[PDB]
Amino acid sequence: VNSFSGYLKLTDNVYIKNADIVEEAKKVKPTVVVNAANVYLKHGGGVAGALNKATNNAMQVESDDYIATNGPLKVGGSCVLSGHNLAKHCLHVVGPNVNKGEDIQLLKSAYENFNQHEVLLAPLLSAGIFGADPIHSLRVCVDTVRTNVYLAVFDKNLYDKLVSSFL
Ligand SMILES: CC(C)[C@H]1CCCN1c1ncnc2[nH]ccc12
Ligand SMILES: [Cl-]
């Protein structure tokens, strides 16, 4: 039993809710919140810009030190950093950005990072300003993640389409 509330159960391990991931994280304080990161951990917009804003830029400060030490992530890769005031940890995961011409097959690799964590709060990878088809992202999530994932979808109209079209 966990404190996530109001989720629709899509499968044995995948749950979904129309919710602002920022507000969800502040309420639940999950062990792991997933960020929709880029390889430079430059949290300027989309989910990443919103999460970073909620940390008063502490996420960005920590991220800049991480990049200065380690260099950029790989597309499809991840790193674990602090969750600041939002969660114990933040798993920064880089899905392919279609508006950069990145290979959509890497979306499965991106979701594989979730399997290293028993329970996560997360957005749909490569959705929003990353330009992938969210119905596809949900399909890959369900077919790749085996741990317990609670998906927050910001857009109510998109949420209704994902549920109604879910096979
Ligand atoms: C609409 C969703 C599929 C993705 C794509 C863009 C933004 N988005 C978000 N999802 C969850 N929580 C969020 N908080 C702020 C933005 C945001
Ligand atoms: Cl985004």
Swiss-Prot record:
Inhibited in vitro by GRL-0617. It is found in: Host endoplasmic reticulum membrane. Residues 1-167 form the Macro domain. This is Papain-like protease nsp3. It catalyses: Thiol-dependent hydrolysis of ester, thioester, amide, peptide and isopeptide bonds formed by the C-terminal Gly of ubiquitin (a 76-residue protein attached to proteins as an intracellular targeting signal). May form homohexamers. Interacts with N protein. Changing residue 31 to A: In strain: Mu/B.1.621. Responsible for the cleavages located at the N-terminus of the replicase polyprotein. Participates together with nsp4 in the assembly of virally-induced cytoplasmic double-membrane vesicles necessary for viral replication. Antagonizes innate immune induction of type I interferon by blocking the phosphorylation, dimerization and subsequent nuclear translocation of host IRF3. Also prevents host NF-kappa-B signaling. In addition, PL-PRO possesses a deubiquitinating/deISGylating activity and processes both 'Lys-48'- and 'Lys-63'-linked polyubiquitin chains from cellular substrates. The chain holds residues 1025 to 1191 of 7096 of the full protein. It is a multi-pass membrane protein. It comes from the Viruses.
